[PDB]
Structure 1
Amino acid sequence: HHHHHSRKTYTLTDYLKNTYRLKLYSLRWISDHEYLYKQENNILVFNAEYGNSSVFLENSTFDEFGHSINDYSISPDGQFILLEYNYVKQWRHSYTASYDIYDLNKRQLITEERIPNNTQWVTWSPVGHKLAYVWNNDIYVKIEPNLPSYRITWTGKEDIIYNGITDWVYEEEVFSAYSALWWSPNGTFLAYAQFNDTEVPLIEYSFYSDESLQYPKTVRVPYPKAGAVNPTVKFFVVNTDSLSSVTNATSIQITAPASMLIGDHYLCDVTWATQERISLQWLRRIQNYSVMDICDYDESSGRWNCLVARQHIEMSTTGWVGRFRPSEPHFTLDGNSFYKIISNEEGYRHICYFQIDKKDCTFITKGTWEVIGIEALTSDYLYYISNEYKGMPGGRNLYKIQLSDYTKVTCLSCELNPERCQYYSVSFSKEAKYYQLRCSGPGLPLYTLHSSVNDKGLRVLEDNSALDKMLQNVQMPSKKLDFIILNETKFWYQMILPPHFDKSKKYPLLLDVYAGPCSQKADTVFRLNWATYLASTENIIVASFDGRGSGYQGDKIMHAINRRLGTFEVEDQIEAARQFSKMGFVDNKRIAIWGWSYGGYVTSMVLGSGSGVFKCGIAVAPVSRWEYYDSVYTERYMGLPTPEDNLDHYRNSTVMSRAENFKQVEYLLIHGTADDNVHFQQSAQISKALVDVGVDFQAMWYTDEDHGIASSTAHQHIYTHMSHFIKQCFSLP
């Protein structure tokens, strides 16, 4: 006699076997009024205005073709389609793939001049159907798909010269992309970066591969660690309309400004402003000075010219510039003007309106909250996402600000579904006539289509009511999102609370940590993850806390950690644990802490801190010493590791040096052997240091797994392993 009370829970197997599936609505705008979608492997074109769908491409159309199609890409005139197959992952964004090209208008694979195998990147012109692609580190161009490729570059060399693609560090840290190609708006020009890694040292690690490989492989990746020789970067614009079959193409270099060329620098942003105007942002290796150049094509010259009167300096007095890098500009149609997120005089990031010719801008938004990103710009309105609503830093809403009158701001998402939806992202149509809103929490994700013409609702695309239906008699956890005041400053935290939560009880508590610069682990987003399991099934509270260094709350918080990683942000997680147990429902004898990446670092520093607050912890792929991590990330916060910059704190902020203190706590240390990002080296050194002071601990390596330890089988194993470690630490049976 159960009387239909919820006696199910969200179990480890539910998380690992993906029992409760979260439906999404993934679309691609092809025009200003139409988008593409995958119904049942079929591709439907959708009219957003009416709803009516014409089948664009039938599922069966290919794969008589004989390979598994990984992805596709329709030429922006809707006349061709790029078919991506033989997908082979590399780093976070990079990978190789075979490609073929199908002719929509005339129904046939292009059989001549095919894109070669092992193409590293491929891309259409924004208008028409010009193709640009890198192969063996060189850029090729095809004006028509079935015609021969024009070769733009000749200098590409594996692991040394990169034309049109990033190298390891630019990929992961600057452009969050493999592509270093940029077409001008009408496809006339192809901008590209060229990276030179000749002197960049190589990280080397064993790759064991299939048990068939008799001798392991040694992977060797150009990877600059803190203070090492960084790669150098050149930038070019070629004209794709004046290519020829009888003469190599002319690339026009645009050199970096005087102020950058004097030392180590980076290319950090490329952004076309018009058919003939492009903007570069350059950053010094010491990342507190950045210069935006704005370059015009000289018609008769055939060359590019960045006038020094249109240089714009962005610099930071209290830290580095940009959140992780300088914010990208959004130009007005004529390109005489642009909007850009920059920190205001009070430390809060806001939308500044710049004139191509004036130094001074005007902030069109302000307040003790921040703009997260500018999403769309029309002649009349600017669309952006901010955390202004109810002064909740971990919330997100779409707003439109009236270009002509900055006082007239309208929240587009806030009141749609206030209790279900406080975390929005948007997808605008080609010219912003329509938009999709993607609500992510605190309730179930909700996807919806909108006319910007009068900001009304067209339809609910996905309401996740299958999932809602499944969860009725599941004892799901609840989330609490709130703050505490330390030093007269709000600091936000979130608690995944076990079902039928009881403030009389004393629950064990897992502190889930990231805590890196500009991190936010305290938000209104809805998640079915490992933490959900622990709360629902194991009655553990999983909390996270955004203390000093965290993002989206202003520079006084974010920069507080500048030149000083492994200090306040570490200290604040320890205090977070105390504050929690001061709230009355936390078992002091059972407080764990865990984290991946920077989070692994913070966990490890916490456990080695000698605080006595934590019983145990798990570090996965942790950083152990900032001289081991990459330059562009690390130096951003740490400076250079040299006696005349900041070696002292590089040296003072290693988990190794705290080995002695681990005698006080139980430690699981996990790391994948093929981790190209946070090298296994880093954990290997933690282990050695612990061995040398006689502290026992738990360890697990993952053969051939990278930073995300994302293999299906490997993913299931680590979380299973961690669950055991946690369960036995907390005496859960």
Structure 2
Amino acid sequence: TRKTYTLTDYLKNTYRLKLYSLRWISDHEYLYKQENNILVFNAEYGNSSVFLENSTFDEFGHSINDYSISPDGQFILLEYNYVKQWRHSYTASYDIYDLNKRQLITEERIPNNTQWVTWSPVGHKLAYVWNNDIYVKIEPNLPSYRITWTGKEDIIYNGITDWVYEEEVFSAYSALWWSPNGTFLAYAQFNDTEVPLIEYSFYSDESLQYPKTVRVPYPKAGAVNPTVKFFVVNTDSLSSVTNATSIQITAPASMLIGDHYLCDVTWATQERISLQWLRRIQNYSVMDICDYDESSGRWNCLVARQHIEMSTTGWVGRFRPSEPHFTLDGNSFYKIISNEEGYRHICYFQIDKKDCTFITKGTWEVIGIEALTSDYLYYISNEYKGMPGGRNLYKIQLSDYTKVTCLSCELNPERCQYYSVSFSKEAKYYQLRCSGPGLPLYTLHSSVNDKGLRVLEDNSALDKMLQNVQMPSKKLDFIILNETKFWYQMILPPHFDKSKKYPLLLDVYAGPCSQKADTVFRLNWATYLASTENIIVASFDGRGSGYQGDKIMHAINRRLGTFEVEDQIEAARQFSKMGFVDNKRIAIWGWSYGGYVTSMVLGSGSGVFKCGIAVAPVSRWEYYDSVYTERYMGLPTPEDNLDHYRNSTVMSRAENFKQVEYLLIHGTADDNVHFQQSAQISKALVDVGVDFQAMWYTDEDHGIASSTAHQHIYTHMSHFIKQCFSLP
């Protein structure tokens, strides 16, 4: 008899999903790290050569974290001494190895504790950030040119983002943008002078006698936000004698009237740059198109070339205004914008014209623009079979928009319904990446006639290993609420019997633009729950979920903690009424936004759920950051939305926790959703005489990702779900 997928299998990664992460270096070749060696692959034929041997740095004296080959293939940036900061930020030490003269560079080295580093897009110049200031290196063995002198820790950030812009704006620490050929270097400067500081204890190793206090400039909803300036420097006209001159591009008058943000930077051509600015009330945005004036040496942003993007029903973009995709001449562009029916589609714009032309339409949405040529635009969309949880690669003929070709739909319909893509420099080749419903499949294709060149990775090994395992299945379907269909997914136990009552665990995210019902193949905690414990694990996408139009997505506008909470209950209420679900054994679990939703559901007084687990939950919107919270909630002032901020808390619902079993988990060093949020939930339940289970994780952050902690969290939650469902 065959084994089940156990907790130890999930925790020890017994069953590994094989990947194929390649790095395009031209229109014809990619790099692939095989057996610790870097190899060069000709996409057309499949043949390789050794680019770099694993033995090359055996006598290095440091464990190399990562590598970054210069665009010209002449130099290798060696990353070591990695110290993680936030989600994307880190400091490390760098060394440059000359690939041609087979020797490390010992002259003018990149300093230690370097905040960010990047090769120019072409050649081998380097831009780097150290002690909050930007430095440029025209050649690796040559002295650096200092670009900024204003850099100050926790106050003035140049070429790097502060806490909020990293997390909610650029999803990156870098605030550097090189021009296509690397002539110009564009950067953002952040000022956090009056932004209040989130403070928390850090315990460190047992040896630290007194705990350390961590102080992060973090703007909570309604607090003073950072300020932003935008600059462009010419890296071709740098001097050793004279200090560098940075040209400032100011925000439009429409933004300068009040609080705003820089939300997108995208070069159009070698001398044209686009910028998107977003107001603190995230329903108004402005794009500026800025050209380099060779005579004056200034960057002029014509008013005729401004583009207003706005929303009357909600905020702008899924999480922020979308990225424009400029043509070779940069005189026109393509951008995903929400249409008149509230569905996200590609619009075509002229730089000097107000009206744009939608090139796509329908009751589905475009996920992203992936590649652009003079003949075709390539994009991902959830159009195929009307499944909002599916993803496929499409090409639209730019001369005849009626000529839309799906490139992945029919490749393998049974195994592959969720795709991502990666194109070569001029889109000659593409790698398709299938992530479900079947095991991941990686393939290489060529754009000329959309030929299927070869299979890169098929995970056949994992398939052979999974043959001897009692694996769970996945049902993707929908329910109808108020004439609207909403999707759900259920991880069903092996040998599923529709004539038996199974306990049910509802796995929730339910945040704005979330999607928990999809065709992706996952090997996680829910796998073990269904495989070993015979628990149905369900997720549902109600109002406020994304990829289905603004009518659904904007339903929770100015009203977080309402519809998305109600809808989760209505979904569980419906599942309970199915013959195969044991209505006396229904549980709910969520992390981050899902933890807030889990806690609002447990305190709703619905009687549907027996128990629940909240991990690093948000408890009161006034405790979460400005950028995210205010996008959906607006400002927490009496003139704006203070009443909703006030009545959308977990705390006010404490009394309702009397008829449920609750497990509240949070890491002490969470810089994202501060421990404060959970400390306020516990205090409220204590205040109304409600018994619950609690677990803190010393020095753990939002991820609770340290190997020991990760094993500890899932062990502790497993015992709880098991005790709740009367399972041995």
- Which TM bucket (shorter chain)? over 0.9
The answer as to 2:445 corresponding to 1:445 is: no
Which whole-Å CA distance do the structure 1 matches of 2:612 and 2:28 have between them? 51
Alpha-carbon contact 2:22-2:30 (below 8 Å) kept = yes
Counterpart of 2:417 in 1: which secondary structure? coil
How far residue 212 of structure 1 moved from its aligned partner, in angstroms, is 0.9
Which whole-Å CA distance do the structure 2 matches of 1:714 and 1:358 have between them? 55
Alpha-carbon contact 1:548-1:557 (below 8 Å) kept = yes
Mind listing any 5+ residue stretches in structure 2 that lack a counterpart?
A: none
Alpha-carbon contact 2:516-2:541 (below 8 Å) kept = yes
In structure 1, the partner of 2:696 is: 701
Which whole-Å CA distance do the structure 1 matches of 2:488 and 2:666 have between them? 27
Which whole-Å CA distance do the structure 2 matches of 1:95 and 1:618 have between them? 31
How far residue 503 of structure 1 moved from its aligned partner, in angstroms, is 1.1
Which whole-Å CA distance do the structure 2 matches of 1:83 and 1:475 have between them? 44
2:580 aligned to 577, 585, 589, which one? 585
Which whole-Å CA distance do the structure 2 matches of 1:454 and 1:115 have between them? 46
Alpha-carbon contact 2:367-2:382 (below 8 Å) kept = yes
Q: Deviations over 1:469-507 (max 9, x none)?
A: 001121100000010110100100000000111111111
Counterpart of 1:267 in 2: which secondary structure? strand
1:432 aligned to 427, 434, 459, which one? 427
Cα RMSD for the two superposed structures:
0.6
Q: Following superposition, which runs of at least 4 residues in structure 1 exceed 2 angstroms of deviation? A: none
Counterpart of 1:140 in 2: which secondary structure? strand
Q: Deviations over 1:653-708 (max 9, x none)?
A: 00011000000100000000010000000001000001100100000000100001
Counterpart of 1:708 in 2: which secondary structure? coil
The answer as to 2:44 corresponding to 1:49 is: yes
Sequence identity (%): 100
Q: Deviations over 1:256-306 (max 9, x none)?
A: 000001000000000000000000000000000000001001110100010
Q: Deviations over 1:94-115 (max 9, x none)?
A: 1001000000111110001000
Alpha-carbon contact 1:616-1:666 (below 8 Å) kept = yes
Q: Deviations over 1:1-54 (max 9, x none)?
A: xxxxx5310000000010100000001001111101111001111111111110
Alpha-carbon contact 1:63-1:69 (below 8 Å) kept = no
How far residue 621 of structure 1 moved from its aligned partner, in angstroms, is 0.3
Q: Deviations over 1:190-240 (max 9, x none)?
A: 000000000000000001011111111100000000000000000000000
Which whole-Å CA distance do the structure 1 matches of 2:94 and 2:393 have between them? 37
Alpha-carbon contact 2:445-2:453 (below 8 Å) kept = yes
Alpha-carbon contact 1:79-1:104 (below 8 Å) kept = yes
In structure 2, the partner of 1:141 is: 136
How far residue 584 of structure 1 moved from its aligned partner, in angstroms, is 1.8
Q: Deviations over 1:290-326 (max 9, x none)?
A: 0000100111010001001110000001000000000
Which whole-Å CA distance do the structure 2 matches of 1:429 and 1:579 have between them? 47
How far residue 583 of structure 1 moved from its aligned partner, in angstroms, is 2.2
Q: Deviations over 1:491-526 (max 9, x none)?
A: 000000001111111110000000000000000000
Q: Deviations over 1:46-72 (max 9, x none)?
A: 111111110000001013111111110
Counterpart of 2:198 in 1: which secondary structure? strand
Alpha-carbon contact 2:543-2:555 (below 8 Å) kept = yes
Q: Deviations over 1:613-657 (max 9, x none)?
A: 000000000000000000000000000001000010000000011
Which whole-Å CA distance do the structure 2 matches of 1:580 and 1:308 have between them? 55
Q: Deviations over 1:530-587 (max 9, x none)?
A: 0000000100000000000000000000000000000000000000101112222111
Counterpart of 2:723 in 1: which secondary structure? helix
Mind listing any 5+ residue stretches in structure 1 that lack a counterpart?
A: 1-5
Counterpart of 1:177 in 2: which secondary structure? coil
Which whole-Å CA distance do the structure 2 matches of 1:237 and 1:352 have between them? 28
Matching of residues 145-156 of structure 1 within 5 Å: 145-156=140-151
How far residue 454 of structure 1 moved from its aligned partner, in angstroms, is 1.1
Alpha-carbon contact 2:621-2:629 (below 8 Å) kept = yes
Counterpart of 1:126 in 2: which secondary structure? coil
1:234 aligned to 219, 225, 229, which one? 229
Counterpart of 2:321 in 1: which secondary structure? coil
Alpha-carbon contact 2:177-2:187 (below 8 Å) kept = yes
Alpha-carbon contact 2:28-2:424 (below 8 Å) kept = yes
1:124 aligned to 108, 119, 124, which one? 119
Aligned length: 728
Which whole-Å CA distance do the structure 2 matches of 1:275 and 1:336 have between them? 12
Which whole-Å CA distance do the structure 1 matches of 2:286 and 2:278 have between them? 7
How far residue 443 of structure 1 moved from its aligned partner, in angstroms, is 0.3
Alpha-carbon contact 1:503-1:584 (below 8 Å) kept = yes
Alpha-carbon contact 2:542-2:568 (below 8 Å) kept = yes
Alpha-carbon contact 1:438-1:446 (below 8 Å) kept = yes
The answer as to 2:527 corresponding to 1:527 is: no
The answer as to 2:647 corresponding to 1:652 is: yes
Counterpart of 1:440 in 2: which secondary structure? strand
Alpha-carbon contact 2:429-2:446 (below 8 Å) kept = yes
In structure 2, the partner of 1:481 is: 476
Which whole-Å CA distance do the structure 1 matches of 2:675 and 2:22 have between them? 38
2:636 aligned to 626, 629, 641, which one? 641
Counterpart of 2:645 in 1: which secondary structure? helix
Q: Deviations over 1:332-356 (max 9, x none)?
A: 0000000000000000000000010
How far residue 724 of structure 1 moved from its aligned partner, in angstroms, is 0.5
Which whole-Å CA distance do the structure 2 matches of 1:583 and 1:185 have between them? 57
How far residue 372 of structure 1 moved from its aligned partner, in angstroms, is 0.3
Counterpart of 1:494 in 2: which secondary structure? strand
2:109 aligned to 114, 126, 137, which one? 114
In structure 2, the partner of 1:68 is: 63
Counterpart of 1:548 in 2: which secondary structure? coil
Which whole-Å CA distance do the structure 1 matches of 2:648 and 2:596 have between them? 10
Alpha-carbon contact 1:574-1:611 (below 8 Å) kept = yes
In structure 1, the partner of 2:183 is: 188
Matching of residues 496-645 of structure 1 within 5 Å: 496-645=491-640
